[PDB]
Amino acid sequence: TAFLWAQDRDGLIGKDGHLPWHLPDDLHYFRAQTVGKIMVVGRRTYESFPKRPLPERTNVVLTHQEDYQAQGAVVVHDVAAVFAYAKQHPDQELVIAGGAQIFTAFKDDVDTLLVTRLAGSFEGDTKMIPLNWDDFTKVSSRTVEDTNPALTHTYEVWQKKA
Numbered sequence: 392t393a394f395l396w397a398q399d400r401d402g403l404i405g406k407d408g409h410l411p412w413h414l415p416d417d418l419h420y421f422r423a424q425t426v427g428k429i430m431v432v433g434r435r436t437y438e439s440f441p442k443r444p445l446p447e448r449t450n451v452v453l454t455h456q457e458d459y460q461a462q463g464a465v466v467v468h469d470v471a472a473v474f475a476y477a478k479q480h481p482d483q484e485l486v487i488a489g490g491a492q493i494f495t496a497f498k499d500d501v502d503t504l505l506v507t508r509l510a511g512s513f514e515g516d517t518k519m520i521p522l523n524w525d526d527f528t529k530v531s532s533r534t535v536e537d538t539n540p541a542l543t544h545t546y547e548v549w550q551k552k553a
């Protein structure tokens with residue numbers, strides 16, 4: 392599995408559904424880390440989208456309620472159903488974008504950890520869960536400085552090893 396969430400040093404991850412800061416570059420990297428692979432999102436992250444569903448990519452939704460409905464999307468209701476669908480499609484991959492409940496839902500079968508740190512401080516309402524970094528190892532990284540110092544961030548790429 393692969394994780395990917397945008398959080399700032401203030402332990403933030405989002406705010407009012409959309410993000411608290413404006414990072415056009417990070418918003419363009421999402422389309423690059425979603426096409427070709429399966430995009431797994433929760434119900435709060437689904438409606439949080441602008442013009443859903445997202446085309447050019449799979450749209451899965453994990454929910455334990457028989458009331459939520461999604462037209463043109465694989466509504467899964469079990470962790471085995473999400474992994475069972477990935478087995479039939481080996482050409483694609485599993486990627487977690489949110490919400491916080493979806494991350495901890497697949498935190499057990501997690502492998503890669505793509506975290507986007509931002510130098511600019513931003514306060515919101517939702518925070519990121521406590522990941523066990525004492526069980527991972529760095530392998531690659533990509534630093535990038537925007538026009539404003541606060542708009543500075545770095546894509547850290549870690550890999551599980553045991």
Ligand SMILES: COc1cc(NCc2ccc3[nH+]c(N)nc(N)c3c2C)cc(OC)c1OC
Pocket residue numbers: 395396397408409410417418419420421440441487488489507
């Ligand atoms: C306000 O603009 C937008 C906001 C969001 N919010 C969710 C969001 C934002 C950045 C993200 N960045 C990375 N690295 N990975 C994610 N998983 C991710 C997600 C899940 C998502 C958008 O497209 C889906 C979008 O349009 C650009």
